Design a protein around this ligand. Structure first.
Ligand SMILES: *Cc1c(COP(=O)(O)O)cnc(C)c1O
Ligand SMILES: *Cc1c(COP(=O)(O)O)cnc(C)c1O
Ligand SMILES: *Cc1c(COP(=O)(O)O)cnc(C)c1O
Ligand SMILES: [Cl-]
Ligand SMILES: [Cl-]
Ligand SMILES: [Cl-]
Lengths: 502, 502, 502
């Protein structure tokens, strides 16, 4: 399943996971279960509870924390309350009841877009990790969704439905990008045309100015990028972000930006395009990778309250405004005041079902607890732990290839590129590396590792020339498995060197 | 929020919830958390775990159950294992690891449609509650989705995409139905035409043969019904099910049926249209109402392995088959073998994202635990408890209107119709009831209750004549609130009688 | 072993068992162990105790119950004391010491026939479950034996020894009966002649009046029947019991009746022939099936204090009375006052060993605890639980054969008859069922299930015509195993229908 996921979906699945916010969730659940039972009125039954009451919830919660000081999840829950009440200044009783009611999953999400306090908490996390601090928190709204996967499906459908993207429109795509994102515009369902914004291996996988300038073409309605990138696993540098900023400000104030920033926390000092061009950007952030929460399906779509999506909607042709008046008629009297972010919500479940739309309340609670976990960790201990783990696995991989590729300030390294030439160069000089590349390819490299270790790697391209290389995730295997990849690739190189000399 | 949900979405939200399977979930979570920590290799860190190991899981689980015999959730978990292993004959280690891995939400759902053992467990529950026992379990497949809400959105979109429903096609809709289901075909996005299959108040809200025969019109491609009904809250009787069966067998073997059977468990001896016409029916079942789990967003789409949806797909015009070959190309070599149920899955997240599609693994685990809860309860104690609760609230409501409407074998009563004429008839004779109806309407009835009690009711129509009536849910309020509705409606009747006499 | 038991012994072995009276037994054992240690006088030894003292036993027992309120077995023991003392009016100290001394197995059973208080307790259970309430409790005596198996061996041997049954005497046997009971009279050791009292499939396996009238033949000395029957699994109806009653009263006051009523508790409102003709009947009751206690070997022989066995003994020819005077000489001065029930006891172990004869004291204690368990359960919860379990397994079996045979008021259903004709009739009409029977037999039916499922069934006959049928026990398998039998038998029927049509 780990090997099959990389081939099919270009992921990625970590073998680590955040335990403390998970324990806090299950412990909160036991508290909420007791809260439900406090509202059950009848004798001689079993298995039926009532709704949790907001009245006196703080005092009951405080007792629960005091009696269970020995439980890690409970201590976390205790500090979470302080963080929300004391640092965020939010209503403590309202926070607790939203969490209790939320984890019970006994009420339809209200509002459907996101639960009130969860939105306020999660956006603090999002703003911080995206480097978007210069934007007032109150100007950022979130739509809680079933991972980045759901976000992308919802966004393209709403773009189509609301006439923001039309058949024949050009979508610029920062490349190399993983397979799934190439196909969605290529669907006849959308019939969009791709323009490649190509990263340069000579610039260490940054986008050249010349490539970024392609965005000046007014036929290009949207810039779509994974940042930090996947496969290449680098973050857009200061120059690149500035270039986009100037292009938007100077030439294309109408350019929509769709940015997928799931790997952000794995970079040093990450800054999102959302931070740089908030009015022009829809941010997709997934909790999957950082918290080891792929199965939880936790994501948000973020939008600035003043954005070009709502501006474009006000500039639509009359026939389209009339069609949308009909579409959203049941939702509100004035459809023209219905914002794009809330249209995403309505479009996600056929409009008529808007009031039972949204991410499940226990999922939002869990998302909120992951968010708190990271926010309360001021010295970034969890982040550093994961980074040290990733570096250890890297050292182990390149042990006999030695050693790892040199990493700059823009490095992410969730993924690593094992380049045959660079490896054979490090081992046996420049002359040998030129020859070794002409002998074997990516196929012979990936098939050998697979046969020796049972691990299949991603080809390392490209698009390029088929420079013989493979990509491994530093997130999904254990040390001896990275050591076995290195050993198999070292024997392959050693046998090439014995076929070099003689 | 309770009053606002009935007006907007025609629900419904229960104030009861199943506690035991929820406690089992949170307890399983604590076990899984410990399982994750067993795979963590490093010192001097906190909050990071590894992946749960299948090896020796039974023995560890058995210890967990033995040490926590005093915990209700744990005892349930213990019996669940026996039920799965002993009664269902499934692999106990594989069940446990699916549940442990599932609740950790650390792996993408695999397969995306449903987790393997969860599917087998949940379909046992579905088949039993739908009265579909005559169908072999192995011939029923499920797609786990975000409630009935997601199911409906997914189904219509896939119908459109795969050319099973086309603009101008007629959709027959069993009525009265709640608002949301009237609007989805009416969307320009689908441009479908509605044909009303009208329930008869004289038949106690059953569909007359003459109304059911409307399905013979070959322009009608789908029969769409909520069964048991909402608002009317009755199940289709033996005659009605037989009529549809003959119509499908005799005249319309091509008729698709879409049935929403969320209220099934609240009827006595429920039998689904899925049981009667499995080859022709897509079953939508929601866990929301029965388990008090609206916020969990838990539903399945059920299909027979041999169905008319796949048959129609094989009979599509060549241009459509060519378009679908392109659409699903990345999924499998032979797109023509891709079944409609799996197309729902692929269509739910844009095709290219099929391998990260599906309901979150902790949601499927919770769904599995609700399913087990009901399956293991042989004497149906929970079902009876809820029914007694509903009846008590009914008795309390009609206490001063006295007494409740007579209920037949097809009665559900999650909702109750408070008919002014019938109430005033029971109180002051037939002559007075005829006059009292001409004086006040549904509006004056609903506005009075709202002003006196703060509870807003649904109008009781119709479509009919505006016979002055209101609908209350027996699931969402407490006893004194039902008593206050009765009292307000009794004083209204008493003041009408003092304006009658004089 | 489960499959091998049905073929060899015509059983039957349940996969359920009564746990509470078993836990009570083991808990009582720990109390008794401590009682023994209270009588041990010496230092510096281990593993040796003394005899439990009756003095102060109530107070010590009451402390034991109070300290162990959390133990299910102990709570049962506590309520047992109340039942014996308060409802039965028996000596509480004497009850406790009999139980304590009994479970220690440190004294020879005294008296050998049954322990005093155990007899009083167990007969209350027997009288109730046999519907024999009209008989005063004090007029019923029991001989505790090693299951019904030992009872039958003991009874025939004593019948022979005491000249109540002689070579060439006719034994009437209610049939169909299971194999073991056909062979015991056929032994040259007894040389008895069988007369078949045949049950009628047209009467749903009741004995016709014409068949019951066969008992008028004065050459028939004993009527031997399993009631409720095995294999057929029905109880004798009101008419049948009345017929025997009149035959005994009117024509055959000398007719001995031997009735085996092990399945009694699985019928609704069971009434034994012992209840109807107590003076003429020896009742054999086994605890094996109802309590899931086959390995415990627990049975009683019941006799009325005024019976025709003792009457016949007084009418024996002088040469036989002289021989029996010699045989029983050591037992009592007046052998002619030695009752048949006590002769069973003496005959069971060669007469000279009468005073070390009888069922082991821990077995009698366990029997007493099973008896209490059922007596104290006023709402018959355990009985209903087992019946619901049996019905669930039946529903699961006939799921695809659908559905189960219609059951009347005389139904027991521990066993179920799977009739090919009736099954194929229910599925494909009367015409097909006539043909399907001519194609395959019982052999082809039983061998197919065995090969597909690994379960071997009993042939369903007869004696009859070999109507193609099989018998399954609803007591010995789990749900998926019944489901696999149904599925194998459905595919067999479906392939017959494809060989019917074409
Ligand atoms: C892993 C990954 C995601 C996260 O997907 P979810 O559906 O949120 O789990 C998003 N984008 C990219 C490019 C990824 O590699
Ligand atoms: C409540 C209800 C449902 C359940 O909705 P979910 O989205 O599954 O919570 C489905 N159909 C009808 C008609 C209802 O009233
Ligand atoms: C099972 C059974 C018994 C019980 O036998 P024990 O020796 O008491 O276990 C007695 N009679 C019949 C006909 C049976 O099937
Ligand atoms: Cl914890
Ligand atoms: Cl618990
Ligand atoms: Cl115990």
């Amino acid at each position: 399943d780990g090997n099959r996921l990389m081939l099919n979906a270009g992921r990625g699945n970590p073998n680590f996971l955040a335990t403390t916010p998970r324990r806090a969730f299950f412990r909160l659940g036991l508290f909420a279960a007791a809260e439900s039972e406090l509202s059950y009125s009848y004798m001689n039954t079993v298995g039926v509870g009532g709704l949790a009451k907001i009245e006196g919830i703080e005092g009951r919660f405080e007792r629960y924390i005091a009696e269970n000081r020995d439980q890690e999840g409970v201590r976390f829950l205790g500090k979470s309350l302080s963080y929300v009440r004391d640092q965020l200044g939010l209503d403590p009783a309202a926070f607790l009841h939203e969490m209790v009611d939320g984890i019970l999953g006994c009420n339809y999400p209200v509002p459907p877009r996101m639960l009130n306090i969860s939105e306020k908490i999660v956006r603090q996390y999002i703003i911080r990790e995206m480097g978007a601090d210069a934007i007032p928190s109150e100007s950022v709204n979130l739509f809680a969704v079933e991972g980045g996967t759901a976000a992308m499906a919802y966004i393209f459908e709403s773009m189509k439905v609301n006439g923001l993207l039309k058949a024949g429109d050009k979508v610029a795509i920062g490349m190399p990008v993983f397979t799934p994102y190439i196909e969605i515009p290529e669907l006849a369902q959308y019939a969009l045309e791709e323009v490649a914004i190509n990263a340069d291996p000579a610039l260490n996988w940054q986008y050249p100015d010349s490539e970024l300038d392609k965005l000046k073409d007014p036929a290009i309605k949207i810039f779509f990028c994974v940042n930090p990138s996947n496969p290449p696993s680098v973050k857009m540098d200061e120059r690149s972000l500035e270039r986009v900023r100037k292009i938007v400000a100077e030439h294309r104030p109408d350019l929509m930006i769709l940015t997928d920033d799931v790997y952000g926390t794995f970079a040093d000092g990450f800054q999102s395009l959302f931070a740089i061009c908030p009015a022009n950007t829809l941010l997709v952030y997934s909790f999957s990778k950082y918290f080891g929460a792929t199965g939880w399906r936790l994501g948000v779509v973020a939008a600035h309250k003043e954005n070009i999506f709502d501006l474009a909607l006000g500039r639509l042709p009359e026939s389209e405004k009339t069609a949308l008046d009909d579409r959203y008629r049941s939702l509100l009297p004035d459809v023209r005041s219905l914002k794009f972010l809330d249209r995403l919500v309505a479009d996600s479940r056929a409009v008529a079902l808007n009031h039972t739309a949204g991410l499940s309340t226990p999922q939002q609670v869990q998302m909120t607890l992951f968010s708190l976990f990271a926010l309360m960790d001021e010295s970034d201990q969890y982040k550093h732990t994961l980074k040290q783990l990733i570096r250890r696995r890297e050292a182990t991989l390149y042990r006999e290839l030695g050693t790892p590729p040199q990493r700059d300030e823009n490095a992410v390294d969730y993924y690593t590129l094992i380049d045959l030439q660079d490896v054979t160069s490090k081992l046996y000089g420049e002359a040998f590396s030129k020859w070794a590349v002409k002998q074997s390819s990516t196929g012979d490299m990936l098939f050998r590792i697979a046969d020796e270790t049972g691990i299949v790697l991603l080809p390392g391209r490209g698009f390029g020339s088929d420079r013989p290389s493979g990509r491994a995730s530093l997130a999904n295997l254990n040390e001896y498995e990275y050591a076995a990849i290195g050993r198999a690739l070292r024997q392959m190189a050693d046998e090439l060197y014995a076929q070099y000399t003689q």
